Design an enzyme around this catalytic site. Structure first.
Site, PDB file in Angstrom:
ATOM      1  CG  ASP A 126      -2.046   0.965   1.158  1.00  0.00           C
ATOM      2  OD1 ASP A 126      -1.978   1.926   0.365  1.00  0.00           O
ATOM      3  OD2 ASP A 126      -3.016   0.782   1.922  1.00  0.00           O
ATOM      4  CB  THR A 127       2.068   3.549  -2.706  1.00  0.00           C
ATOM      5  OG1 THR A 127       0.859   3.668  -3.465  1.00  0.00           O
ATOM      6  CG2 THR A 127       2.983   2.500  -3.341  1.00  0.00           C
ATOM      7  N   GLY A 128      -0.301   4.133  -0.344  1.00  0.00           N
ATOM      8  CA  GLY A 128      -1.083   5.175   0.293  1.00  0.00           C
ATOM      9  C   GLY A 128      -0.990   5.123   1.809  1.00  0.00           C
TER      10      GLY A 128
HETATM   11  C1  LIG Z   1      -1.182   9.502   7.276  1.00  0.00           C
HETATM   12  O1  LIG Z   1      -2.155   8.418   7.389  1.00  0.00           O
HETATM   13  C2  LIG Z   1      -1.892   7.218   6.743  1.00  0.00           C
HETATM   14  O2  LIG Z   1      -0.866   6.973   6.053  1.00  0.00           O
HETATM   15  N1  LIG Z   1      -2.936   6.327   6.972  1.00  0.00           N
HETATM   16  C3  LIG Z   1      -3.020   4.933   6.430  1.00  0.00           C
HETATM   17  C4  LIG Z   1      -4.279   5.038   5.549  1.00  0.00           C
HETATM   18  O3  LIG Z   1      -5.405   4.958   6.067  1.00  0.00           O
HETATM   19  N2  LIG Z   1      -4.160   5.240   4.168  1.00  0.00           N
HETATM   20  N3  LIG Z   1      -5.320   5.352   3.389  1.00  0.00           N
HETATM   21  C5  LIG Z   1      -5.517   4.178   2.539  1.00  0.00           C
HETATM   22  C6  LIG Z   1      -5.657   2.777   3.255  1.00  0.00           C
HETATM   23  C7  LIG Z   1      -6.592   1.681   2.609  1.00  0.00           C
HETATM   24  C8  LIG Z   1      -6.480   0.269   3.441  1.00  0.00           C
HETATM   25  C9  LIG Z   1      -7.533  -0.876   3.036  1.00  0.00           C
HETATM   26  C10 LIG Z   1      -7.235  -1.847   1.963  1.00  0.00           C
HETATM   27  C11 LIG Z   1      -8.191  -2.878   1.585  1.00  0.00           C
HETATM   28  C12 LIG Z   1      -9.477  -2.971   2.269  1.00  0.00           C
HETATM   29  C13 LIG Z   1      -9.805  -2.025   3.339  1.00  0.00           C
HETATM   30  C14 LIG Z   1      -8.845  -0.992   3.715  1.00  0.00           C
HETATM   31  C15 LIG Z   1      -8.057   2.080   2.585  1.00  0.00           C
HETATM   32  O4  LIG Z   1      -8.731   2.194   3.619  1.00  0.00           O
HETATM   33  N4  LIG Z   1      -8.458   2.270   1.317  1.00  0.00           N
HETATM   34  C16 LIG Z   1      -9.894   2.644   1.007  1.00  0.00           C
HETATM   35  C17 LIG Z   1     -10.216   3.533  -0.156  1.00  0.00           C
HETATM   36  C18 LIG Z   1      -9.480   4.658  -0.610  1.00  0.00           C
HETATM   37  C19 LIG Z   1      -9.918   5.381  -1.732  1.00  0.00           C
HETATM   38  C20 LIG Z   1     -11.207   4.957  -2.484  1.00  0.00           C
HETATM   39  C21 LIG Z   1     -11.931   3.848  -2.032  1.00  0.00           C
HETATM   40  C22 LIG Z   1     -11.397   3.101  -0.799  1.00  0.00           C
HETATM   41  C23 LIG Z   1     -12.018   1.902  -0.150  1.00  0.00           C
HETATM   42  C24 LIG Z   1     -10.827   1.385   0.671  1.00  0.00           C
HETATM   43  O5  LIG Z   1     -10.097   0.408  -0.115  1.00  0.00           O
HETATM   44  C25 LIG Z   1      -7.377   2.037   0.336  1.00  0.00           C
HETATM   45  C26 LIG Z   1      -6.239   1.367   1.120  1.00  0.00           C
HETATM   46  O6  LIG Z   1      -4.980   1.877   0.619  1.00  0.00           O
HETATM   47  C27 LIG Z   1      -5.322   6.636   2.583  1.00  0.00           C
HETATM   48  C28 LIG Z   1      -5.414   7.763   3.620  1.00  0.00           C
HETATM   49  C29 LIG Z   1      -4.290   8.682   3.851  1.00  0.00           C
HETATM   50  C30 LIG Z   1      -4.407   9.744   4.849  1.00  0.00           C
HETATM   51  C31 LIG Z   1      -5.656   9.903   5.637  1.00  0.00           C
HETATM   52  C32 LIG Z   1      -5.797  11.021   6.682  1.00  0.00           C
HETATM   53  C33 LIG Z   1      -6.370  10.756   8.027  1.00  0.00           C
HETATM   54  C34 LIG Z   1      -6.481  11.865   8.965  1.00  0.00           C
HETATM   55  N5  LIG Z   1      -6.041  13.138   8.557  1.00  0.00           N
HETATM   56  C35 LIG Z   1      -5.492  13.410   7.278  1.00  0.00           C
HETATM   57  C36 LIG Z   1      -5.364  12.359   6.329  1.00  0.00           C
HETATM   58  C37 LIG Z   1      -6.766   8.962   5.384  1.00  0.00           C
HETATM   59  C38 LIG Z   1      -6.643   7.907   4.389  1.00  0.00           C
HETATM   60  C39 LIG Z   1      -3.026   3.840   7.629  1.00  0.00           C
HETATM   61  C40 LIG Z   1      -3.152   2.397   7.029  1.00  0.00           C
HETATM   62  C41 LIG Z   1      -1.666   3.898   8.398  1.00  0.00           C
HETATM   63  C42 LIG Z   1      -4.140   4.027   8.716  1.00  0.00           C
END
Ligand SMILES: COC(=O)N[C@H](C(=O)NN(CC[C@@]1(Cc2ccccc2)C(=O)N([C@H]2c3ccccc3C[C@H]2O)C[C@H]1O)Cc1ccc(-c2ccncc2)cc1)C(C)(C)C
EC number: 3.4.23.16
Lengths: 99, 99
Positions: free
Chosen positions: A25-27
């Site tokens: 996960d690059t995100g």
């Molecule tokens: C700096 O924070 C991070 O890097 N957070 C990561 C994170 O959530 N990354 N997500 C992404 C995490 C993942 C994990 C997942 C994979 C498969 C099944 C369920 C879940 C996720 O939840 N995703 C969701 C998503 C995104 C876009 C469109 C549809 C969907 C549905 C779902 O798949 C993509 C994955 O990459 C993008 C993100 C970045 C910053 C903030 C933030 C939140 C608060 N303030 C500002 C920005 C909120 C969200 C952690 C995994 C460590 C929690």
């Protein structure tokens, strides 16, 4: 190897002698795995995702293999919807995005 | 180009005549952007990630440009804490993970 994104980039990882499936996960800044046991002491961390924040346990310097590639870093454990390998470890295995 | 993962992979995208910054997210199935207006029809959808689910509007066949690369696909709009470019569009620009 080169991984296309037509399907989820799910790979096999090895941690604590056990094999698990995780998403490259690059995100994600960090690496978060589903509940499991890890050695030593842990520190608290609140991580925010699409639906809000969750509490996780932070373990440092944990050996972990990703697609056979050896890494040693921080692993967060908690109620995550799926195991995800974040940039902290993707950088260790030399991963980049290309197009 | 080759995008390093030492930092968050943020890129500029052009959509709906607007310019926004988004995260190249290999862990995301879909593309979700913060509240904005888009033309055409749409339908409600619930997407889940760390922390739970959020409701978004699903717009299909939306033209988008990422780093000069044009593509078209579904774009979700809603209360996402950050703009994310998912696999549905990453594939169209020929983006891959390499290590
Ligand atoms: C700096 O924070 C991070 O890097 N957070 C990561 C994170 O959530 N990354 N997500 C992404 C995490 C993942 C994990 C997942 C994979 C498969 C099944 C369920 C879940 C996720 O939840 N995703 C969701 C998503 C995104 C876009 C469109 C549809 C969907 C549905 C779902 O798949 C993509 C994955 O990459 C993008 C993100 C970045 C910053 C903030 C933030 C939140 C608060 N303030 C500002 C920005 C909120 C969200 C952690 C995994 C460590 C929690």
């Amino acid at each position: 190897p080169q991984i296309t994104l037509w399907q989820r980039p799910l790979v096999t990882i090895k941690i604590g002698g056990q094999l698990k499936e995780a998403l490259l996960d690059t995100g994600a800044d960090d690496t978060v795995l589903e509940e499991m046991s890890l050695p030593g002491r842990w520190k608290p961390k609140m991580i925010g995702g699409i639906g809000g924040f969750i509490k996780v346990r932070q373990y440092d310097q944990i050996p972990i293999e990703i697609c056979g590639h050896k890494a040693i870093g921080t692993v967060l454990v908690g109620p995550t919807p799926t195991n995800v390998i974040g940039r902290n470890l993707l950088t260790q295995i030399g991963c980049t995005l290309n197009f």
